Design a protein around this motif. Structure first.
Motif, mmCIF file in Angstrom:
data_model
loop_
_atom_site.group_PDB
_atom_site.id
_atom_site.type_symbol
_atom_site.label_atom_id
_atom_site.label_comp_id
_atom_site.label_asym_id
_atom_site.label_seq_id
_atom_site.Cartn_x
_atom_site.Cartn_y
_atom_site.Cartn_z
ATOM 1 N N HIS A 223 -13.615 17.485 -16.168
ATOM 2 C CA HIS A 223 -14.504 16.672 -17.144
ATOM 3 C C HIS A 223 -13.501 15.726 -18.043
ATOM 4 C CE1 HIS A 223 -17.873 19.460 -17.126
ATOM 5 N NE2 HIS A 223 -18.289 18.853 -18.062
ATOM 6 N N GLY A 224 -12.260 15.840 -17.958
ATOM 7 C CA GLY A 224 -11.298 14.980 -18.589
ATOM 8 C C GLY A 224 -11.372 13.789 -18.040
ATOM 9 N N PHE A 225 -11.087 13.782 -16.507
ATOM 10 C CA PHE A 225 -10.549 12.677 -15.818
ATOM 11 C C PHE A 225 -11.660 11.494 -15.938
ATOM 12 C CE2 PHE A 225 -6.828 11.948 -13.232
ATOM 13 C CZ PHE A 225 -7.316 10.851 -12.506
ATOM 14 N N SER A 226 -12.916 11.799 -15.940
ATOM 15 C CA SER A 226 -14.018 11.068 -16.222
ATOM 16 C C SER A 226 -13.887 9.897 -17.301
ATOM 17 C CB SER A 226 -15.628 11.656 -16.578
ATOM 18 O OG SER A 226 -16.251 10.736 -17.354
ATOM 19 N N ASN A 227 -12.995 10.212 -18.114
ATOM 20 C CA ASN A 227 -12.971 9.241 -19.472
ATOM 21 C C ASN A 227 -11.470 9.113 -19.957
ATOM 22 O OD1 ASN A 227 -13.719 7.524 -21.375
ATOM 23 N ND2 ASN A 227 -13.619 9.290 -22.938
ATOM 24 N N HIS A 228 -11.125 7.996 -20.485
ATOM 25 C CA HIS A 228 -9.886 7.459 -20.709
ATOM 26 C C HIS A 228 -8.965 8.393 -21.713
ATOM 27 C CE1 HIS A 228 -6.843 4.010 -21.304
ATOM 28 N NE2 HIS A 228 -6.420 4.669 -20.147
ATOM 29 N N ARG A 229 -9.516 8.797 -22.956
ATOM 30 C CA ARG A 229 -8.721 9.729 -23.539
ATOM 31 C C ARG A 229 -8.585 11.027 -23.236
ATOM 32 N NH1 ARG A 229 -13.698 8.006 -27.527
ATOM 33 N NH2 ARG A 229 -13.224 6.145 -27.999
ATOM 34 N N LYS A 230 -9.281 11.533 -22.508
ATOM 35 C CA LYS A 230 -9.227 12.870 -21.885
ATOM 36 C C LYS A 230 -8.311 12.809 -20.864
ATOM 37 C CE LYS A 230 -14.146 13.427 -23.226
ATOM 38 N NZ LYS A 230 -15.532 13.580 -22.649
ATOM 39 N N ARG A 231 -8.237 11.884 -20.104
ATOM 40 C CA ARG A 231 -7.436 11.783 -18.959
ATOM 41 C C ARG A 231 -5.796 11.617 -19.646
ATOM 42 N NH1 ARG A 231 -8.255 6.925 -16.643
ATOM 43 N NH2 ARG A 231 -10.529 7.544 -16.500
ATOM 44 N N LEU A 232 -5.776 10.813 -20.550
ATOM 45 C CA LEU A 232 -4.500 10.578 -21.209
ATOM 46 C C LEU A 232 -4.178 11.945 -21.837
ATOM 47 C CD1 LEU A 232 -5.211 7.068 -22.803
ATOM 48 C CD2 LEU A 232 -3.400 7.845 -21.203
ATOM 49 N N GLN A 233 -4.834 12.620 -22.563
ATOM 50 C CA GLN A 233 -4.642 14.080 -23.123
ATOM 51 C C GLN A 233 -4.204 14.826 -22.103
ATOM 52 O OE1 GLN A 233 -7.831 15.034 -25.860
ATOM 53 N NE2 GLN A 233 -7.604 12.812 -26.612
ATOM 54 N N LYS B 105 1.178 9.882 -6.182
ATOM 55 C CA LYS B 105 0.586 8.389 -5.622
ATOM 56 C C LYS B 105 0.341 8.500 -4.323
ATOM 57 C CE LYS B 105 3.802 5.504 -8.228
ATOM 58 N NZ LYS B 105 4.237 4.309 -8.411
ATOM 59 N N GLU B 106 0.693 9.368 -3.427
ATOM 60 C CA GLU B 106 0.161 9.577 -2.054
ATOM 61 C C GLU B 106 -1.243 9.553 -1.855
ATOM 62 O OE1 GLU B 106 2.788 13.125 -3.044
ATOM 63 O OE2 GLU B 106 2.385 10.891 -3.310
ATOM 64 N N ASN B 107 -1.758 10.809 -2.771
ATOM 65 C CA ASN B 107 -3.113 11.040 -2.619
ATOM 66 C C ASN B 107 -4.167 10.175 -3.777
ATOM 67 O OD1 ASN B 107 -1.575 14.080 -2.690
ATOM 68 N ND2 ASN B 107 -2.417 13.108 -0.943
ATOM 69 N N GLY B 108 -3.479 9.563 -4.471
ATOM 70 C CA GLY B 108 -4.170 8.743 -5.529
ATOM 71 C C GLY B 108 -4.118 8.980 -6.871
ATOM 72 N N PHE B 109 -3.433 10.099 -7.280
ATOM 73 C CA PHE B 109 -3.400 10.653 -8.628
ATOM 74 C C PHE B 109 -1.947 10.614 -9.261
ATOM 75 C CE2 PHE B 109 -7.464 12.208 -9.075
ATOM 76 C CZ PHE B 109 -8.093 12.637 -7.851
ATOM 77 N N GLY B 110 -1.306 9.536 -9.292
ATOM 78 C CA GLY B 110 -0.091 9.336 -9.856
ATOM 79 C C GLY B 110 -0.317 9.115 -11.367
ATOM 80 N N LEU B 111 0.804 9.345 -12.176
ATOM 81 C CA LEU B 111 0.648 9.387 -13.784
ATOM 82 C C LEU B 111 0.442 8.105 -14.170
ATOM 83 C CD1 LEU B 111 3.348 11.922 -14.687
ATOM 84 C CD2 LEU B 111 1.154 12.115 -15.162
ATOM 85 N N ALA B 112 0.928 6.992 -13.584
ATOM 86 C CA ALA B 112 0.556 5.676 -14.009
ATOM 87 C C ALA B 112 -0.939 5.176 -14.094
ATOM 88 C CB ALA B 112 1.638 4.534 -13.088
ATOM 89 N N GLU B 113 -1.287 5.598 -12.989
ATOM 90 C CA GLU B 113 -2.617 5.299 -12.620
ATOM 91 C C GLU B 113 -3.612 5.909 -13.628
ATOM 92 O OE1 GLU B 113 -3.381 6.291 -8.557
ATOM 93 O OE2 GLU B 113 -2.483 4.470 -7.583
ATOM 94 N N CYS B 114 -3.466 7.295 -13.850
ATOM 95 C CA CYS B 114 -4.171 7.785 -14.873
ATOM 96 C C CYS B 114 -4.173 7.301 -16.377
ATOM 97 C CB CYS B 114 -4.210 9.370 -14.829
ATOM 98 S SG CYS B 114 -3.946 10.122 -13.198
#
Lengths: 402, 127
Positions: free
Chosen positions: A188-198, A116-125
């Motif tokens: 590559h994943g983080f650009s899109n929802h399905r791949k971020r979730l995976q 969360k501190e840096n902006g990459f918490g699990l909930a946000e992604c």
């Protein structure tokens, strides 16, 4: 027996695995050693089924397949390695010929994103966030051993093609290009929802495997609880994975208890369990997915087994909801299985408090359920001077309680 | 030190809280002016199912005069004139008075209270 009939039937194979030991596992290890060197979906079905066979010589091929661009197969390998790690010590006893390459690939999957501190918490992604509310460094690759590619989202080239180009354009340190490949497929994943979730799910599974057998940190428990508390209701798979990861972590327990809120009747985990139970009992409320409910009960059992968790399940009064389950749940195999899990949890709690159980008339409920299951067997076998396995396990756990 | 308990609670201290099979009572209940499908009876059973073990025991003491559960079940509930089943009578007096008990008949007289909450409140105050 019927295992042998299933083997003969399988020995359209992929159609049967889609519908759903030595020479069948050997044909599987075959196609594993073949595909990793109308193919990918056969590998995926082989994996999804093998993750059931082990649950009642593949290690090397599985680590070789954990290095693939397609996340589906990575997830399947991870789920198979979760099954192994959780229920038997098959990869813990293994030698360092491949145990270390495995655990290092798992570490490179699991390692933190900044929380969360840096902006990459699990909930946000897991929430979409429009792709503009995340740190601009999410689609930035900074491999240093010095590669600093940026905007891997703008680049449309296949991830493996990019990795190959990096391989030729630069001399990447030998036997550690995996951390580059995992960073590139993440960016590559983080650009899109399905791949971020995976990727999130893959990281969670990797944690859990690495704990049933530097990755864990103060924010991880909170982040997982936040994943659970998401209201989208389309992330049940992610929530289940998070719960399984929490269960692994339990194997910090006071922090798990403080975050989940099990010390009070009102608290996210207690309320969630009670909702799952009411949806299971009442048809009107939409039943929570089987996997999610399984994960919740497994977490409860794995907690009750520790004195701090059993005392928390005392404090929130889960005995009343679990006796509700064991009183009103139906007869179908999944419902039988939930009743068995509830009985085991009640047994683990009653190993340190009796007053709640007694006050809820639990003994009467247990005896009535035993009568109801024996009466349902009485139809198949009325003689008095084979049982369905799930009912036999219910009877067994309930007689052990008595 | 004993004077902290009530006359109910001293019995519950000496002989313990019974487990009341409300389903056994329902199977052995007689309705006289109410009916088994009367709305006041469904409210009664909802209330009695909602009471905890101690309020159930206090109810059992209120209507039978004891916490003792009959081994054979409430079908064998004795009264003044031989085996008397538990029994609920509608109290046609004003509904601003508490339920009333005649334990030798195992008899509850219950006014037609206008709501679940009021009936439950008055019953809980009785027990």
């Amino acid at each position: 027996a019927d295992c042998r009939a299933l083997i003969d039937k399988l020995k359209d194979e992929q159609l049967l695995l889609e519908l759903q030991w030595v020479d069948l596992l050997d044909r599987f290890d075959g196609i594993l050693a073949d595909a990793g060197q109308q193919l990918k979906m056969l590998l995926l079905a082989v994996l999804n089924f093998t993750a059931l066979l082990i649950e009642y010589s593949s290690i090397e091929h599985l680590t070789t397949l954990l290095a693939s661009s397609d996340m589906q197969v990575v997830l399947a390998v991870l789920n198979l390695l979760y099954v192994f790690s959780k229920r038997s010590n098959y990869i813990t006893r293994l030698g360092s010929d491949k145990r270390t390459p495995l655990l290092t690939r798992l570490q490179h999957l699991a390692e933190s994103w900044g929380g969360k501190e840096n902006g990459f918490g699990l909930a946000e992604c897991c929430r979409d966030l429009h792709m503009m509310k995340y740190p601009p460094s999410a689609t930035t690759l900074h491999f240093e051993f010095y590669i600093h590619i940026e905007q891997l989202d703008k680049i449309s080239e296949s991830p493996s093609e990019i990795m190959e180009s990096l391989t030729k354009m630069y001399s990447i340190p030998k036997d550690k290009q995996m951390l580059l490949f995992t960073h590139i497929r993440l960016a590559h994943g983080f650009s899109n929802h399905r791949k971020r979730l995976q990727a999130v799910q893959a990281r969670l599974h990797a944690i859990s495997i690495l704990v049933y057998s530097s990755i864990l940190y103060n924010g991880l428990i909170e982040e997982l609880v936040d994943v659970l508390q998401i209201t989208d209701k389309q992330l049940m798979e992610i929530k289940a994975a998070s719960l399984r990861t929490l269960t692994s972590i339990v194997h910090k327990l006071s922090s798990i208890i403080d975050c989940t809120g099990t010390a009070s009747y009102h608290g996210f985990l207690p309320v969630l369990v009670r909702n799952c139970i009411q949806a299971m009992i009442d048809p009107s409320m939409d039943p929570y997915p089987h996997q999610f409910a399984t994960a919740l009960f497994s977490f409860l059992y794995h907690l009750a087994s520790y004195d701090a968790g059993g005392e928390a399940l005392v404090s929130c009064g889960m005995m009343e909801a679990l006796l509700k389950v064991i009183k009103f749940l139906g007869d179908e195999q999944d419902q039988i299985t939930f009743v068995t899990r509830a009985v085991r949890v009640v047994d683990l709690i009653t190993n340190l408090d009796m007053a709640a159980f007694q006050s809820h008339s639990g003994l009467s409920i247990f005896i009535y359920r035993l009568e109801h299951e024996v009466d349902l067997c009485r139809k198949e076998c009325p003689f008095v001077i084979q049982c369905i396995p799930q009912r036999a396990a219910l009877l067994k756990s309930m007689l052990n309680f008595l | 030190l004993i004077s902290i308990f009530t006359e109910q609670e001293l019995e519950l201290l000496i002989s313990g809280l019974p487990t009341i099979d409300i389903d056994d009572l329902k199977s052995n209940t007689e309705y006289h002016k109410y009916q088994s499908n009367s709305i006041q009876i469904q409210w009664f059973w909802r209330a009695l199912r909602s009471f905890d073990q101690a309020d159930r025991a206090k109810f059992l003491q209120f209507v039978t005069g004891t916490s003792k559960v009959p081994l054979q079940g409430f079908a064998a509930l004795e009264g003044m004139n031989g085996i008397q089943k538990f029994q609920i009578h509608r109290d046609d007096r004003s509904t601003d008075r508490l339920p009333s008990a005649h334990t030798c008949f195992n008899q509850l007289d219950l006014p037609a209270y206008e709501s679940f909450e009021k009936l439950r409140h008055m019953l809980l105050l009785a027990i």
